[PDB]
């Protein structure tokens, strides 16, 4: 008998006959309260009663239904969430109906931490990840960058080994928004946990793909950060053709990312005993000043640091 907290005929717990036996326990804020919240009558009513059943540790079906109300009033109340999981096991509640419940409330409050942790606990209990990828994809359809949704997705995939269709899901989302950095991150998560980037063909496929993305949207930082992130490993200087290929986009696709990337390739060449050190150093120092003074002034302190640092090292 779930009387919706939003029902036009919702009645305060203190006016409910099936609760008249229990005395509500008010909150102890002290004689001189600080950061005292002026609760609404409904809020105050449900919590004073939640306090009552919790203090007496009443593991009843009525207590179970009430935590639902306390959660809807403040879904961030982790103490209520704990007691709710306590009652889910005591009363031996159908955990699949509870999945239905958590599905609803996460759709409503997708950025709440408790709601996602609870769903995870349920999936563990049931050892059933069958609804997960689909449920998370629906949340990501509303906010493709929801951090908890991506975190839950990673946990389900690694935990239950559901790797097979993720790269495909990644390509789909990258098509929708090539600038969605969460997806660029997922791409790396899938690849490094499956084939790895040591496989030259994979690496080649990844660098090529990324380069095509930079050609399409030159000012998209994610693709630039991804290109750097996957090559930076073995060292950018380890890839001789790359400097050339980017030096070619110098007129066509020349954002301050390309410039910054060149200073990055130079920094690594200098560290890895490159030919023409005096020469390479000057170019990299030139770019640091162009960046600091003209192209990327917001980061002037950084680029100057880089220039200084490059000198002190490779003078």
């Amino acid at each position: 008998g779930f009387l919706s907290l939003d029902s036009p005929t919702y009645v305060l717990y203190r006016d409910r006959a099936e609760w008249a036996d229990i005395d509500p326990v008010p909150q102890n804020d002290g004689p001189s309260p600080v950061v005292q919240i002026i609760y609404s009558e409904k809020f105050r009513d449900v919590y004073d009663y939640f306090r009552a059943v919790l203090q007496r540790d009443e593991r009843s079906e009525r207590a179970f239904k009430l935590t639902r109300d306390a959660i809807e009033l403040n879904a961030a109340n982790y103490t209520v969430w704990h007691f709710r999981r306590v009652l889910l096991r005591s009363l031996q509640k159908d955990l699949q109906e509870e999945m239905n419940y958590i599905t609803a409330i996460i759709e409503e409050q997708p950025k709440n931490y408790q709601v996602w942790h609870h769903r995870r606990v349920l999936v563990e209990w049931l050892k059933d990840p069958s609804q997960e990828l689909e449920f998370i994809a629906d949340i990501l359809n509303q906010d493709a960058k929801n951090y908890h949704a991506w975190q839950h997705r990673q946990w389900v995939i690694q935990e239950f080994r559901l790797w097979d269709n993720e790269l495909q899901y990644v390509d789909q989302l990258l098509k929708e928004d090539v600038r969605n950095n969460s997806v660029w991150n997922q791409r790396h998560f899938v690849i490094s946990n499956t084939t790895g980037y040591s496989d030259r063909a994979v690496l080649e496929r990844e660098v090529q793909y990324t380069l095509e993305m930079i050609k399409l949207v030159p000012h998209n930082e994610s693709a630039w950060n991804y290109l750097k992130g996957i090559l930076q490993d073995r060292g950018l200087s380890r890839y001789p053709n790359l400097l050339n290929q980017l030096l070619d986009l110098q007129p066509s696709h020349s954002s301050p990312y390309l410039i910054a990337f060149l200073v990055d390739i130079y920094e690594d060449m200098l560290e890895n005993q490159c030919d023409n050190k005096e020469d390479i150093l000057n170019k990299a120092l030139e770019l640091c000043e162009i960046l600091a003074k003209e192209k990327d002034t917001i980061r002037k302190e950084y680029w100057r640091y880089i220039g200084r640092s490059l000198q002190s090292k490779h003078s």
Binding site: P33, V34, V35, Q36, I37, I38, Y39, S40, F43, Y47, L73, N74, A76, N77, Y78, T79
Partner: peptide, 15 residues
């Protein structure tokens, strides 16, 4: 705010 807050802060009753 250090002494009292509106019910708008009910979402921070656990903070």
């Amino acid at each position: 705010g250090l002494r009292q807050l509106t019910d708008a802060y009910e979402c921070l009753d656990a903070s």
